[PDB]
């Protein structure tokens, strides 16, 4: 989806294999705020939210707590105490076409900065003057959505990047989304120090 209408998916009731997505050797950027990524399979939470969208390579810096710009102020904001991960990689093969791809947009004009995890799809004409717009474009009445010029011959600076943000929410619920548990071989007829499931 576009960054201004990012898509959320709620993941629950399943055994997440976090350390396998860690070592894909595919993701250019992998960060984890508040949770160390080497200990992901032993801390388990109630719900995990996944948010996916597409931005350009120079704006990936903005997808982080405490950052400001155009993406972090009008499109997608993360709180100060975000606990989760941000994963991004370069998808110039799928999201750009010779001459450009004109199906990915981003909001450019807004009255005020977005609150954390707020999604807006309103397309009313932005009033940049004190003049009522009455829905007809012109001077001081601009359309708020600007397209991306995704051209395959750019640098990596303007090259498209796909971003997935995982939000590990913990409410006071018995934490259904837990990771895998290694189960060693079974040995018999020796004084052993067993630990069965419980």
């Amino acid at each position, epitope marked *: 989806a576009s960054v201004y209408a990012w898509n959320r998916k709620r993941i629950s009731n399943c055994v997440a294999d976090y350390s396998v997505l860690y070592n894909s050797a595919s993701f250019s950027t992998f960060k984890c705020y508040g949770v160390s990524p080497t200990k992901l399979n032993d801390l388990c939470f109630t719900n995990v939210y996944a948010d996916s969208f597409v931005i350009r390579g120079d704006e990936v810096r903005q997808i982080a707590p405490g950052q400001t710009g155009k993406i972090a102020d009008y499109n997608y904001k993360l709180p100060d105490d975000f606990t989760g991960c941000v994963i991004a990689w370069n998808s110039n093969n799928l999201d750009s076409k010779v001459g450009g791809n004109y199906n990915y947009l981003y909001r*450019l*004009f807004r*009255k005020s900065n977005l609150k954390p995890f707020e999604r807006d799809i309103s397309t009313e004409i932005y009033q*940049a003057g*004190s003049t*009522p717009c009455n829905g007809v*474009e*012109g001077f001081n009445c*601009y359309f708020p959505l*600007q397209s991306y010029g995704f051209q395959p011959t750019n640098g990596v600076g303007y090259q498209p990047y796909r971003v997935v943000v995982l939000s590990f929410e913990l409410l006071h619920a018995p934490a259904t989304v837990c990771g895998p548990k290694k189960s060693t071989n079974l040995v018999k007829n020796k004084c052993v120090n067993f630990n069965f499931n419980g």
Partner: antibody
Framework: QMQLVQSGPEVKKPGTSVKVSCKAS????????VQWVRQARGQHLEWIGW????????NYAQKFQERVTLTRDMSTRTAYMELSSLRSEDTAVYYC????????????????WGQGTVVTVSS | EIVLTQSPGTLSLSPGERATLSCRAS???????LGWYQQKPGQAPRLLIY???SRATGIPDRFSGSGSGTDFTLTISRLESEDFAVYYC?????????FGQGTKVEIKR
């Protein structure tokens, strides 16, 4: 201070192409829009075109539609106009004008004006 | 795409008398998108009236436009030696933005 500082006088020859620029300073340039006009000596003002700083959308008159380009750079806050396929009937003073904007909502008329660059066309 | 005939052709009055310029459009325009500018000999023009009825900032209080439906006016309610210049009307409606011919004011001698 709210101002536009423009380039210097230029002398060009027919058939060539000319490029003029004006740099914004003293206000929030990233939300305003810039319009370009021209004037002969003692003649009426003529509207060349206009451009939005943010999106970059442009509009040109019918006379100049096929032989002018308007561009901008946010990094240095500069506006550029290129006029091509010159003729001797283009010797004039060129002005860029923009409204004073500060980042939230802004004025409803082109209040800020440049000092104009004199372009001479002669072989 | 818009015809803005300006009247009068020239204005010839002494310092103190009052003047009424006008800009006449051959089709309808909205008063929120018409502006009057003033250019003194040799300098860049400075905005005078925006919205056809709202003054600008720094302009004296004497100056005041009117701005009716499609037939716009400009009353200078006393003329100084500062006041002699050329004045233009521009329209901001989506059609090609046009200017008037421009009225020049000279001092009655």
């Amino acid at each position: 201070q709210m101002q536009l500082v423009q380039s210097g006088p230029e002398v060009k020859k027919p058939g060539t192409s000319v490029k003029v620029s004006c740099k914004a300073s003293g206000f929030t340039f990233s939300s305003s829009a810039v319009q370009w006009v021209r004037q002969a000596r003692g003649q009426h003002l003529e509207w060349i075109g206009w451009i939005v700083v943010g999106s970059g959308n442009t509009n040109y008159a019918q006379k100049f539609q096929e032989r002018v380009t308007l561009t901008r750079d946010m990094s240095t806050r500069t506006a550029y106009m290129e006029l091509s396929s010159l003729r001797s009937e283009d010797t004039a003073v060129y002005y860029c004008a923009a409204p004073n904007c500060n980042s939230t909502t802004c004025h409803d008329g082109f209040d800020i004006w440049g000092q104009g660059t004199v372009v001479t066309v002669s072989s | 795409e818009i015809v803005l005939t300006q009247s009068p052709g020239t204005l010839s009055l002494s310092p103190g008398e009052r003047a009424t310029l006008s800009c006449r459009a051959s089709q309808s325009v909205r008063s929120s998108y018409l502006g009057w500018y003033q250019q003194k000999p040799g300098q860049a023009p400075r905005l005078l009236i925006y919205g056809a009825s709202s003054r600008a900032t720094g302009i004296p209080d004497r100056f005041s436009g009117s701005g009716s439906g499609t037939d716009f006016t400009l009353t200078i309610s006393r003329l100084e030696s500062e006041d002699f210049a050329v004045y233009y009307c521009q329209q901001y409606d989506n059609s090609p933005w046009t200017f008037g011919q421009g009225t020049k004011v000279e001092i009655k001698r």
